[PDB]
Amino acid sequence: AMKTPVSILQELLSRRGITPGYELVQIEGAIHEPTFRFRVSFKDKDTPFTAMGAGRSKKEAKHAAARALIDKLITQHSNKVSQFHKTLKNATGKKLLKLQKTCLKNNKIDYIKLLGEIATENQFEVTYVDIEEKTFSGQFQCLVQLSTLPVGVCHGSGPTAADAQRHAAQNALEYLKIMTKK
Amino acid sequence: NLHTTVFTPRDFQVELLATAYERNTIICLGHRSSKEFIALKLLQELSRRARRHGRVSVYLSCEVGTSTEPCSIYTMLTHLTDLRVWQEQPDMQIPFDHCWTDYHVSILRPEGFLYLLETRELLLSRVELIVLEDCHDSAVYQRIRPLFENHIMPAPPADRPRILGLAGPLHSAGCELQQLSAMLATLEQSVLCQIESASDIVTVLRYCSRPHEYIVQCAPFEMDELSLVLADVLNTHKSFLLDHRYDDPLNVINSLLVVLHEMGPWCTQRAAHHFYQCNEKLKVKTPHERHYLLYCLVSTALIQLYSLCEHAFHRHLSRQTIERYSSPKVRRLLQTLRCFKTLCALIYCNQNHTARVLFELLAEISRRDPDLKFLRCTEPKEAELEHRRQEEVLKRFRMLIGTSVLEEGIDVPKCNLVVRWDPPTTYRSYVQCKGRARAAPAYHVILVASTTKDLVHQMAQYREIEQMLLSKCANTEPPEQEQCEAERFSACLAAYRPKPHLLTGASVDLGSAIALVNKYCARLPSDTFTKLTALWRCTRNERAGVTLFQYTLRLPINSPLKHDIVGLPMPTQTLARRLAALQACVELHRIGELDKEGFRALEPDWECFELEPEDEQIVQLSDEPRPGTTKRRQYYYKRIASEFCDCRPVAGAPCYLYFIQLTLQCPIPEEQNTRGRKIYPPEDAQQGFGILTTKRIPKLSAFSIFTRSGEVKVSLELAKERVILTSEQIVCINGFLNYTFTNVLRLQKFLMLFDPDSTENCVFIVPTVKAPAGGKHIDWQFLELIQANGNTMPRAVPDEERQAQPFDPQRFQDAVVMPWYRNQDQPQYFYVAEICPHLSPLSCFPGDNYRTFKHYYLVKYGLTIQNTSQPLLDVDHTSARLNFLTPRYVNRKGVALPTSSEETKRAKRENLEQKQILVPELCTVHPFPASLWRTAVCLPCILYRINGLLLADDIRKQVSADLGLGRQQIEDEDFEWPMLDFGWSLANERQYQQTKNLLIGFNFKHEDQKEPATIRYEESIAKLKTEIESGGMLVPHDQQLVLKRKVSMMELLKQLLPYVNEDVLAKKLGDRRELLLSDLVELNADWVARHEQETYNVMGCGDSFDNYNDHHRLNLDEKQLKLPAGFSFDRQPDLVGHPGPSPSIILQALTMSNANDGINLERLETIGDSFLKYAITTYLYITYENVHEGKLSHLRSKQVANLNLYRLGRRKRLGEYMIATKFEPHDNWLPPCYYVPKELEKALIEAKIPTHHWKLADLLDIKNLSSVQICEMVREKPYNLVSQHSIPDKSIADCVEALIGAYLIECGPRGALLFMAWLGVRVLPITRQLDGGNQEQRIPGSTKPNAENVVTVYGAWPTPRSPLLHFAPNATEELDQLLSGFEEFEESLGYKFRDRSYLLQAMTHASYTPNRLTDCYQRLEFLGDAVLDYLITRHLYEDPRQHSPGALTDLRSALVNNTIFASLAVRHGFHKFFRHLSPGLNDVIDRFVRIQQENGHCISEEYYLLSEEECDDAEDVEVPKALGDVFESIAGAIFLDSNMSLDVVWHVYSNMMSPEIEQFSNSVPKSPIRELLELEPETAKFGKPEKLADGRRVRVTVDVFCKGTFRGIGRNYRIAKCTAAKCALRQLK
RNA sequence: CUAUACAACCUACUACCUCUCU
RNA sequence: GAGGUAGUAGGUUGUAUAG
């Protein structure tokens, strides 16, 4: 049925007598495909049926010979800090331009109140740190911190604590001033 | 790279070494490692004087006697010398066995040696050398003050020992220049020496071309409005940060102000780049919150400055933009590099990042400026990424923005420009920068980026110490005016030509002589460590009151020119230089050296290599697979043997009869005996088989086949009484052959005719019978039976016949018992296994569907068994395949295959479901008896193996005919061959310390009480001040920069040669215009004839190394050229009357491994290829004696390569003598009297297949028809396998090599050489002589006499001329003196030499220029390579383990390696006597030998350079290739001194290689990477390396998962990987 | 030229199926 | 004896990797 047709045809004939003999005729000597070709010599005495078969495998060559026998039949971070501050600067609004168009030398503008207005205007807050010790000069200093993405400190100093925080907010106004102008 | 160099820059340490060898010397060099090498070598050089004078040497040092471990220099003098060197312990108490009278070098304290001279325990006249370690120390000056002022000065200069002081450099004295010069002069008068300086610094300041130094100032900086805002914001931040309170920002402050006040705002924000990149990490990395606030406020200040400077020129508004704010500065430096538009501009700094950013600046100015386009600009991964990036940068700029590392050691091409942007505070670094500009003209730039007058005083100091360095030193440099007048003189002079008729030949003159000499010196064979230069001595003399100079040139030791080229005197130094080099060039061309593949052989057929015509065009068609390779296969005819062609017995002719005598020697195992049969000996066969032939078969070996009965030996035996055949006997024997090879064996197949009258493969096989009286003869009545019983069909006997006949057992005992009822056309032949009386046709059936056997035969066939009382037959299947050559149950290694199980033996031994039972009346007894059937199926392997033995005997016949190698036709009966059996038995921190001595100390001063301002100092200071200010050395701040770039011929003779007259050469010359070099030699000969007394003066440090050739005699030779029993290697049997190699072994070498047989070429192929290399090496050496080894290796690679062996194989046609497929009797073996046509395979590929139509029949004969009829009968409707077989070309080369091996094994190396001559590559000298009286005698080697009776007898190896180069008066005496201390080398090796020139030639490196008497090791290395190669291959071939191909090649390839040879060299102290003046080689060999002795001289190839648990990670171990070449070269030298004998070389090298042989042989240890790969095949990986900062070393890490990461270190990648794998293996053990 | 892995192909074995012989 | 599945042993030809 579904097996090697050499075996099938061997049994099929051996039920009716006569003994077939397969023979190797040419081993092929190719470079990477050394195939084999066999030939069945069925009954070379009376009515010789000698069928050839090609195949890479000896089973496949005998199978093809049997089928032939059947078939013939049917920095950058200092850069990066600068651009998003510009986005914060566009998000600030008008007080940047008032900061440009005023003089920061005068103390008649209140630096802490103006920087608090900037904080209210541009959705952040301002931090004022006056550390408790006294300097070698015997005066007071403050740091203002910009509550945004970067770290942020502008410095200031003065004879009193309030003047130190005012000068820190003045330097923060110088900061936000000096990014502003185009 | 074309280093067209000036004169010969010798090795600078060796240069200082020679100056120390001449006179008392203070060495001016900084590195203490180089100073140790110089000290060591000078001790080695004066060791010979100390021995032959009975003297001693003393080394005085400072740190000695402090620490318990010995000093470094003691470790080197006990490791790398043969010298008895002694170390004094801290507070040494004298042991009784220790003495200075019996120690070579004594390393002593100055106080100790002072005590020795006080107490007469050592004598000053017995001291040969005193060496002072760091004698520029003031404290050790005071220490040697009693030493020198009490003993050295009172001693006379005759008794004064030679004095060396390893001092620090003179730019490192720790004094002002006045007091430096005073300290100098007191120091030379103190220690009785002179300063010899000759550093790389000195080498460029005099020996290299002068770079003009240009000095451009840099102005200070002011602020514009933007920079006023920058300064305002920064000083506000500084004045705030001073008061900021916390009860590293200053670094950012103190650098940002400088980059503001020195470059400007653009570079200020591009430094805010780096500093804000620093702060963006360092404000996050800090844990303190107020420090975080401080760092982030500094970061926001940098944000301010970057915002202002970005709001300054991109927002307010670009070469004008960068030139506006940033100061120009670099403009003059740029114009300096623009005027040079081969430029190799180098810029030097002291920081790596400055070098990177300046590379970026030169890169961006290269791409931006159109005129400047021509400027071509744990966790070890980032280290390699950085290292690869920096070398990419270096390659892009060099084809260099350097730092302090590119100052010493790095070799670069010659430069035009060297830049110093950084103002040099140190002279040493300044001139190491300046040292590279060499291209003549080349320039140096100083950029200083009152005080100007003080730096002018500092360069005045630098120029003045430069003048002291050049003035007090060694041999000077002539000034450039002499080169100017040489350029003037050489303009009209015409160059010398090699061929005077050819005007356009090699133009060589005075103007290019030195360049040709130096290019020839560079092109000699050398490795990295070798620096080959020529040693040039100059000499002053006076002629006619005019100064002239003689210039003795000496070329390197590798060059075959071994005498001194003496130049002839010219007025100055430079013309003497050019004439000496041109005389050297012509002296070279007299011996033809002017310049592998350029060299060709000196004998004809060596350079012929005649290609076969179509094989030639196969060679130039490179698209085809190449000849000599495995990938191309040719189809050869299987030669039927000579004794089997045209030997067919014909009527009337008396014929030879051989009985094919079989003899069973090993019965089959019962484990093999599955069916338990009786064992049948084939000698019990009353009927055997015989061969009838008319040409006599020679004596043949008895070979073994393996059938069912087991191992059966096969031999042939001649019958005494010859056979004469009648016509009818011919007819019946032809019918018998057709029957036996058509029906009994069915070997007859399609396309196959029995043709009895053939001319090829024509022989008879006859059924012989044991005579009943005795003996064997042709069975005539059996032949009558075969005549009666031809191809008779088996007949179905009727019922009446079986009823009539009873059962006879002896009819069916020992007979083939074929059944007639089944298999009518191709009957199945069955043996008789047993006859069962208990069985019957009524006995019980095993199966279920049938009852007893009579009912079975009644049911399935319809046949009635008439007699049911007959006994039955247990039968076997007969032998289907008839190949019995390989034993059925053994592997190729001799390992038995698995036998059958005992259950499947016994269960199927007695069950009736297995076995085969037959009824005797249902069978036909075939006429062939069964023992006759056994030998009849034995026959076809007998015929194939006899045809194999006879083809091997045909090859032996062909060699013994064409070259007299044995008897031509071996037909003597009293001789037999060996049996054909298959073999199947059935230091960095010290460099850091010397860097520290260069950097920070540089101190120490003796005295100041004299008057140092001697006016002449102040005069020289003011003179240098005026010369610098006025001469353009000082370029002022307003001045920019300076990039600037006749005589009658007879009167020319007076100017050029002032020792001749005006009228003498007027008549002497006549027509002659210019005196050529021969004429100049004639003229100087005439003048030394007309002035017979000549004087000479030693000028410079033209050294006293050499002597003899140039010195010593000093007598007017001054003006022109006046068999072990336990297996041997050279086993030489007789060649006269020796029958030669057996055809068994020639057959073994013929048949491949592809044939699956038990005999193989491969072991003989290995021994044959190795002897081919060995003998071609030894003859190649002895032939071309002056030719260096590279060309000889190219000739041997033209010899041994398998294309040439394939050509000799096809010329001898060995393809038609070999076996290429396993013998299979049905497919690849033509029986007697048949033929296979060749062309129908072109008719078989498709074509003739609609259907059959022919069934043979129509093509009755193809051989009888002509080829036109063949092509016709093919066209009326890729190789033969029956008589042809396909063999690849490399296998033919393998057979040629294996045949050489076969001839080697039997008839000696001399027989192998003669057989090598037989193939076609010559190895022996022909002595083509006339006829030797008796031509019939051939003395071994003598070919056939030609048409004019000339024999071409092959002669032996000539003895080569020793390379003792007699060009010296006392070359033997200089050989005896230069080879001192080699006696203990000989005792450490074993073999005393006769000619010690071979010893010195082996142990001279290519660098050791004090050696005139030999050549280098490279010739003896090239010889001892192949000598050791053959010695290893033959000692491993004879191994009774019987190595396979792969096993033998692995065992050799790990037994032959340079690591192995270096290790075995170092164990027996072959480093101790390696005379080398190479520095890097000395350090490599030194650290290797020290960490080999740290391994205690065990042979480790592997366990000296790693453990992860040892802190050896800095400065791993360096395996020297040179000492491996030394072991090879001393092998060659031992071989040559033995009159070319190998048994002496192995007698020596057993004691040096046999432990490693047995160690790697006994266990298979695998490859060390591959063993870890076999333990884990997906786990062990090897990452990329890293290089440490030490300068030679590589680190590679292996990882084994769940076992750890194991670190590794090696100079190369391979040793680091291998030893990481090994230390992983040691941890996993 | 040396080492390792994968694919094919061949035959020597061994144990066992599918038939046949027995 | 034939066809088939596994191991075991010898090898021929490629592909890839490292020395």
Ligand SMILES: *O[C@H]1[C@@H](O)[C@H](n2ccc(=O)[nH]c2=O)O[C@@H]1COP(=O)(O)O
């Ligand atoms: O069928 C073959 C084999 O199995 C069988 N035979 C023969 C002899 C013997 O001792 N044992 C045995 O199993 O007979 C046939 C012969 O083929 P081989 O010659 O054994 O290859």
